[PDB]
Amino acid sequence: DVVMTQTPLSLPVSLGDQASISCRSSQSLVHSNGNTYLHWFLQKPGQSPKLLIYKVSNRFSGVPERFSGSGSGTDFTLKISRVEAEDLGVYFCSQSKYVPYTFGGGTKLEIKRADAAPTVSIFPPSSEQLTSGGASVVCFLNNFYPKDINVKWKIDGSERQNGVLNSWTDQDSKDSTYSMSSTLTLTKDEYERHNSYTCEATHKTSTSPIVKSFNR
Amino acid sequence: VKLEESGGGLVQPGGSMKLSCVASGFTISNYWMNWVRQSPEKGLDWVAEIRLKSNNYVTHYAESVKGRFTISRDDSKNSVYLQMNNLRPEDTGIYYCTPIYSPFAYWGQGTLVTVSAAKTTPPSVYPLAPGSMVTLGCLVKGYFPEPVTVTWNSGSLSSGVHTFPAVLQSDLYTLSSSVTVPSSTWPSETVTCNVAHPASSTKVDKKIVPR
Ligand SMILES: CCCCC/C=C\C\C=C/C=C/C=C/[C@@H](SC[C@H](NC(=O)CC[C@H](N)C(=O)O)C(=O)NCC(=O)O)[C@@H](O)CCCC(=O)O
Numbered sequence: 559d560v561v562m563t564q565t566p567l568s569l570p571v572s573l574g575d576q577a578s579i580s581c582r583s584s585q586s587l588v589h590s591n592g593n594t595y596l597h598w599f600l601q602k603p604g605q606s607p608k609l610l611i612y613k614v615s616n617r618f619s620g621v622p623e624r625f626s627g628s629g630s631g632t633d634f635t636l637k638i639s640r641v642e643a644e645d646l647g648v649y650f651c652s653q654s655k656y657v658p659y660t661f662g663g664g665t666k667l668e669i670k671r672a673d674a675a676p677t678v679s680i681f682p683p684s685s686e687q688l689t690s691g692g693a694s695v696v697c698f699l700n701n702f703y704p705k706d707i708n709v710k711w712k713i714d715g716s717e718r719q720n721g722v723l724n725s726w727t728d729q730d731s732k733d734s735t736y737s738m739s740s741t742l743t744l745t746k747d748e749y750e751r752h753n754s755y756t757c758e759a760t761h762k763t764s765t766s767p768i769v770k771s772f773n774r
Numbered sequence: 775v776k777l778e779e780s781g782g783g784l785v786q787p788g789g790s791m792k793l794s795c796v797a798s799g800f801t802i803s804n805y806w807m808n809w810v811r812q813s814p815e816k817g818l819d820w821v822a823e824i825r826l827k828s829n830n831y832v833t834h835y836a837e838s839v840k841g842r843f844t845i846s847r848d849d850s851k852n853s854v855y856l857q858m859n860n861l862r863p864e865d866t867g868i869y870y871c872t873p874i875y876s877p878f879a880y881w882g883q884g885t886l887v888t889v890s891a892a893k894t895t896p897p898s899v900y901p902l903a904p905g906s907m908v909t910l911g912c913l914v915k916g917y918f919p920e921p922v923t924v925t926w927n928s929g930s931l932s933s934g935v936h937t938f939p940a941v942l943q944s945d946l947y948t949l950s951s952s953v954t955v956p957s958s959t960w961p962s963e964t965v966t967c968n969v970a971h972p973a974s975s976t977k978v979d980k981k982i983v984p985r
Contacts, residue, residue, distance in 0.1 A: 599818075606870060606881040606882065606883055606884055607812075607818065607870075607881055608880070608881065609879050609880075612879075618879065619877065650817075650818055652818070654874065657823075657834045658820050658834070658836050658837070659808070659820040659823075660820065661817060661818040661819075661820070663817055664817060664818075677907075677909070677954070679904070679909040679911075679952070680905070681902040681903070681904070681905070681911055682905055683900075684900040684901050684902065684903075684913070686900055686901070687898070687900045687913075687915075690898065692898075692915075694900070694913060694915065696902055696911060696913055696950060698909060698911065698936070698950075698952045700909070700936055700952065700954070723941050723943060723948055724941070725938035725939050725940075725941050725949075725950070726938075726939070727936065727938060727939065737936045737938070738938075739936075739938040739950045739952070741913070741948065741950065772905040
């Protein structure tokens with residue numbers, strides 16, 4: 559099978575700047591007929607992949623001129639000029655000269671924006687969950703930038719690592735921020751063995767972590 | 775102009791499932807039709823192709839699905855199909871159909887195929903109320919399979935909402951959603967999260983009340 563390799567794996571780019579994505583194929587994608595069967599797809603978060611450029615450089619319908627493709631043989635480049643917020647997502651190269659058709663692993667375009675501190679909210683288990691025997695403590699960490707963040711759960715001053723389920727969003731198309739949900743799930747018994755619950759967020763926007771807590 | 779996939783769902787390993795892909799606003803009879811699947815672990819994975827009546831309906835398959843999957847077309851119904859037999863857990867993923875070398879080379883919204891022995895389980899829906907802006911939430915726990923749909927005030931409340939990607943630990947999914955509104959909005963006005971889990975025929979409304 560033809561291997562498709564993309565670099566870089568992720569690409570932060572400021573609004574209005576140009577982005578360049580590289581795709582390398584293990585075999586030449588030039589057919590006997592003269593066409594080069596290399597294509598670029600974009601998959602925005604929550605969406606299906608969409609065709610951007612077919613046969614190296616041809617824009618598919620509805621694709622603006624700020625998107626352009628180039629290259630030959632086994633080396634190709636997608637250039638996004640004047641990057642817009644709405645251009646975030648994962649860019650895939652693909653070949654259709656040989657069966658099986660194969661895809662690159664994707665390159666994620668991240669839009670640089672001003673740093674933003676996470677808005678942090680913590681929630682005790684609902685009465686309803688408690689009745690059923692479960693006890694989840696939920697912490698939302700919303701609209702932050704850059705994406706890297708670290709969340710620590712503390713119970714009575716002690717860090718708990720087990721029972722934690724975290725979910726991270728993709729970058730938001732509208733404001734270029736990120737959000738995160740952290741749930742510490744205990745049983746009703748374990749939760750009632752303790753009173754003090756703390757969600758602790760480490761992010762570049764603050765030298766000391768953001769701390770949200772409650773006492774049971 | 776659109777492509778619409780259907781036929782997916784939860785199916786036990788060794789099982790069988792038939793996907794449909796129906797086109798609107800154009801005729802598929804003129805274009806090579808492809809199935810492609812997506813998973814977090816493998817990314818985009820080409821599955822099968824069927825060419826034209828004029829190509830003698832020649833087909834091609836990925837090696838991983840040969841002998842098990844069958845791609846077919848019915849131009850008279852403007853549709854392509856994927857019959858899948860002896861399904862494996864690794865066949866799990868979102869399945870798309872697309873015309874290639876075509877003005878109408880769109881992928882549609884896809885159909886989710888879940889191949890697992892795990893049983894269908896309804897979600898528990900728990901309201902998240904606080905102990906200038908106020909953040910409220912809804913915890914949707916212990917369901918299977920995907921998907922669920924979560925909205926707030928039947929979708930009227932869209933700004934300031936974060937619905938997080940479902941997380942699968944073992945055989946149960948957990949999802950949460952948060953909504954942030956001005957302190958003057960709640961609890962003076964109603965804020966209710968609506969959760970739908972078609973697979974278990976579940977619809978739940980949780981009004982967020984103080985305390
Ligand atoms: C499932 C995974 C598969 C991976 C991807 C596979 C295939 C590529 C996918 C889609 C191709 C879509 C092509 C659409 C062509 S119509 C099809 C196009 N025909 C042409 O003549 C190409 C255009 C010409 N080379 C040019 O750009 O000047 C073509 O590709 N012909 C076949 C050939 O040249 O060999 C036009 O309708 C574009 C419309 C442009 C517009 O409206 O502005």
